[PDB]
């Protein structure tokens, strides 16, 4: 198959970034695309094979290497805030209808200062009694607030398993201050269950938020907790009422 | 752009059919592909068609190709909420190594829930008290309702989100609003929005 690492990256301005893309399918043609949230895909680099490197339709400060068939890494020599987006790697088969296969992508954010990086605060809000009385249903709300960058994955967990039915999370996070470039973010989510399911005290509800931040390699001189990759969580139990 | 798509975007109700168009000027022509791209995800290949084939089927997706008029149609049968995505038309000129892929700009398809029994209401969600926020939930309105942003920078309002309780066979919209200020109350939270006249305020 086709692979990309890291899934997420937050880095300071001026530092070197390498994005890994590999595949063992024996494909010759490889691509690098760039895409901002809500925008169209822009081809940035392509490759015919083992020792080929051609520029895409959009100009970039990034270079690519193809010393081997298996590897097509992207290199950002000095990062700038404007490099912030999703980078997607692709390969096409030499056989059949020549299908194109996309890697899982790398979401990169270049911040001016690594002290702009904050993990989410996570809070769960219990179902309204008026909703229960009116609908025979109960909606829990989860809020993840004040996180930077927007490298976050929210999930609901009921009794230790992840739930997908009855859930809606915002497609994109809100900006706390839409005026700033390194503004912090807020995300909302909903889980709706039946009133009888909520009213059972044995039922346990947890909102989990996987945050992607600094690594053990990154330096931290500030007093606050280092904003590492972590899960910040909040929970609630079924109410007897 | 050598590849053009129509419409730019469209909104349909779940259960309905829709057709998306693609027109190209790419010469020479080898194959045409349709991609589905979900939000925050890479595109997924749906149908690849060479000039030799006029039809290709992938479940509920059926692609059509007329290589003479350089046109393709993608038909979605009995649309579903999960069909909400960007649909890309991509064209190849050669099947050899020297070939190239041309990407259309995409069509944004939104599929709405068919809400038969709208019960619009604004609820207050009892604070965790571990948090200083107060949360209001605008819910159970039909998809015709638009949720506006607040006129206060200390008030946050998230757009309508479709929730799907597959068991009860029940779908519902909702919008979340929160603030830290003592001013904030659920009666005025969605004041900037045009809400149904019969909205329940407990």
Pick the last residue of a domain from A85, A112, A139.
Answer: A112
Query: In terms of domains, do A67 and A159 share one?
Result: no
User: Could you tell me the domains of chain B?
Assistant: 1-113 (2.60.40.10), 114-202 (2.60.40.10)
Enumerate the residues of chain A whose CB falls inside 8 A of the CB of residue B130.
123, 234
**Partner B, chain A 16-75, Cβ-Cβ below 8 Å:** 28-29, 31, 37, 40-41, 43, 46, 48-49
Per DSSP (E only), the strands in chain A are 2-5, 8-12, 17-23, 29-35, 42-47, 54-55, 62-64, 74-76, 85-92, 100-102, 106-111, 121-125, 137-147, 152-158, 161-163, 167-169, 174-175, 185-194, 204-211, 230-237
β-pair partners for A205: A158, A236
Residues of A in contact with B89 (CB under 8 A): none
Distance to chain A for B110, nearest Cα, Å? 13
Taking residue B162's Cβ as centre, other Cβ atoms within 10 Å add up to 19
Is A76 in the same domain as A162? Answer: no
Phi, psi of A196 (to 5 degrees): -65, -35
Say yes or no: A48 and A17 in one domain.
yes
Does A218 lie in the same domain as A163?
A: yes
User: What is the span of the domain harbouring residue A33?
Assistant: 1-112
Q: Do A32 and A1 belong together in one domain?
A: yes
Q: Which residues pair with A75 in a beta bridge?
A: A18, A63
Nearest Cα of chain A lies from the Cα of B17 at a distance, in angstroms, of 24
Residues A127 and A197 grouped into a single domain: yes
Number of domains in chain A: 2
For B42, which of A49, A104, A139 is closest by C-beta distance?
Answer: A104
Q: Verify that A22 and A54 share a domain, yes or no.
A: yes
| CATH assignment of the domain containing A93 | 2.60.40.10
Q: Cβ separation of B176 and A190 shorter than 8 Å?
A: yes
Q: Do A48 and A25 fall into the same domain?
A: yes
The phi-psi region of residue B44 (left if phi > 0; otherwise alpha if psi is between -120 and 50; otherwise beta) is beta
Q: Which of A57, A80, A112 is the last residue of a domain?
A: A112
Q: Which residues of A16-52 are buried (b: 16+ CB within 10 A; e: fewer)?
A: ebebebbbeeebbbbbbbbbeeeeebbbbbbbbeeee
Among residues A112, A128, A159, the one where a domain terminates is: A112
Pair (A94, A9) in one structural domain: yes
Site from A143, A156, A158, A241 to mutate, B interface, most B CB atoms within 10 angstroms: A143
Instruction: State whether residue A189 is helix, strand or coil.
Output: strand
- Residue B3 · residue B102 · CB < 8 Å: yes
> Mind spelling out the 3-state secondary structure of chain B?
CCEEEECCEEEEECCCCEEEEEEECCCCCCEEEEEEECCCCCCEEEEEEECCCCEEEECCEEEEEECCCCEEEEEECCCCHHHCEEEEEEEECCCCCCCCEEECCCEEEEEECCCCCCCCEEEEECCCCCCCCEEEEEECCCCCCCCCCCCCCCEEECCCEEEEECCCCEEEEEEEEEECCCCCCCCCCCCCCCCCCCCECC
Whether residue A178 sits in one domain with residue A104: no
Same domain for A107 and A191, yes or no, is no
Number of Cβ pairs < 8 A linking chain A and chain B: 142
Same domain? A197 vs A161: yes
- Rounded Cα–Cα distance for residues A22 and A69 (Å): 9
Does the CB of A120 have a partner CB in chain B at under 8 Å? no
């Amino acid at each position: 198959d086709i692979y990309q690492t890291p899934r997420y990256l937050v880095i300071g301005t001026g530092k070197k970034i390498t994005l890994e893309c590999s595949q063992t399918m024996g494909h010759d043609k490889m691509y690098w695309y760039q895409q901002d949230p809500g925008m169209e895909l822009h081809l940035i680099h392509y490759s015919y094979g083992v020792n080929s490197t051609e520029k895409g339709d959009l100009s970039s400060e990034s270079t690519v290497s193809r010393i081997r068939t298996e590897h097509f890494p992207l290199t950002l020599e000095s990062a700038r805030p404007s490099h912030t987006s999703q980078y997607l790697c692709a390969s096409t088969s030499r056989r059949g209808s020549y299908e194109q296969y996309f890697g899982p992508g790398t979401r990169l954010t270049v911040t001016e200062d690594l002290k702009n990086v904050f993990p989410p605060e996570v809070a769960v809000f219990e179902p309204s009694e008026a909703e229960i009385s009116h609908t025979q249903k109960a909606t829990l709300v989860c809020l993840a607030t004040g996180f930077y960058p927007d490298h976050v994955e929210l999930s609901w967990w009921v009794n230790g398993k992840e739930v997908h039915s009855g859930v809606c999370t915002d497609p994109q996070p809100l900006k706390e201050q839409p005026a700033l470039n390194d503004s912090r973010y807020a995300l909302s989510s909903r889980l709706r269950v039946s009133a009888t399911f909520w009213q059972n005290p044995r039922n346990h509800f947890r909102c989990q938020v996987q945050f992607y931040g600094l690594s053990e390699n990154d330096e931290w001189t500030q007093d606050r907790a280092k904003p590492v990759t972590q899960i910040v969580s909040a929970e609630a139990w079924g109410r007897a009422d | 752009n050598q590849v053009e798509q129509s419409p730019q975007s469209l909104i349909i109700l779940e259960g309905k059919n829709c057709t998306l168009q693609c027109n190209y000027t790419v010469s020479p022509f080898s194959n045409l592909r349709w991609y589905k791209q979900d939000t925050g995800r890479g595109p997924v290949s749906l149908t690849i068609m060479t000039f030799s084939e006029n039809t290709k089927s992938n479940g509920r997706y059926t692609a059509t190709l007329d290589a003479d008029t350089k046109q393709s149609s993608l038909h979605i049968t009995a649309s579903q909420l999960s069909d909400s995505a960007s649909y890309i038309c991509v064209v190849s000129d050669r099947g050899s190594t020297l070939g190239r892929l041309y990407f259309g700009r995409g069509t944004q398809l939104t599929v709405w829930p068919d809400i038969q029994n709208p019960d619009p209401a604004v609820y207050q969600l009892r604070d965790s008290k571990s948090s200083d926020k107060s949360v209001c939930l605008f819910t159970d309105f039909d998809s015709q309702t638009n949720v506006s942003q607040s006129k206060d920078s200390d008030v946050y309002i998230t757009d309508k989100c479709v929730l799907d309780m597959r068991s009860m066979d029940f779908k519902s919209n909702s919008a979340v609003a929160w603030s830290n200020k003592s001013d904030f109350a659920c009666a005025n939270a969605f004041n900037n929005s045009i809400i149904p006249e019969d909205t329940f305020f407990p």
